[PDB]
Design a protein around this nucleic acid. Structure first.
Length: 117
DNA sequence: AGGAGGGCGAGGGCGATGCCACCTACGGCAAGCTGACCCTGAAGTTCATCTGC
């Protein structure tokens, strides 16, 4: 009854149009967004924060759910299109290169295989 | 010598023993800090040791 009650009301929220994930998604709080055109070319880094007195990480976008990385070789995981700032621009604030470079290298391979599929 | 040393019954009868108004007035009764120090996690990887080849 602990987790059955959760699925029971998730089946009600998903059928009553309450704005929730639909098979493989998650309302992940994404801070800064990346704007492009039809062939790349970065445009603007818009931010959808400005909410509470403690600036959270943007708005909860209905993006695919995280696959749960966590590990020494956490770069080999990599999510779909949303991830980390070291997974997209290969820039690390307190992690350094190589460790964050492999993250972007695997994110590029994931994006390429998604485009091929 | 023999005496008799008071018989008697009244000793408070009357009423007030507090009249007032106060018994507090002031303003403080916290000021300063703590209220947590460390760990131990999910999840994948990684090294030297357990064992067979």
């Amino acid at each position: 009854m602990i987790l059955h009650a959760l699925t029971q009301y998730y089946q009600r929220k998903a059928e009553s149009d309450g704005g929730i994930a639909q098979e493989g998604f998650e309302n992940k709080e994404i801070p800064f967004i990346i704007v492009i055109d039809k062939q790349g070319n970065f445009i603007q880094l818009e931010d959808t924060r400005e909410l509470k007195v403690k600036k959270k990480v943007g708005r909860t976008f209905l993006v695919p759910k995280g696959l749960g990385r966590s590990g020494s070789k956490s770069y080999e995981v990599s999510n779909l299109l949303w991830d980390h700032y070291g997974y997209v621009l290969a820039y690390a604030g307190e992690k350094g290169q190589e460790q964050a470079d492999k993250q972007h290298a695997s994110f590029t391979a994931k994006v390429n295989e998604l485009k091929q599929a």
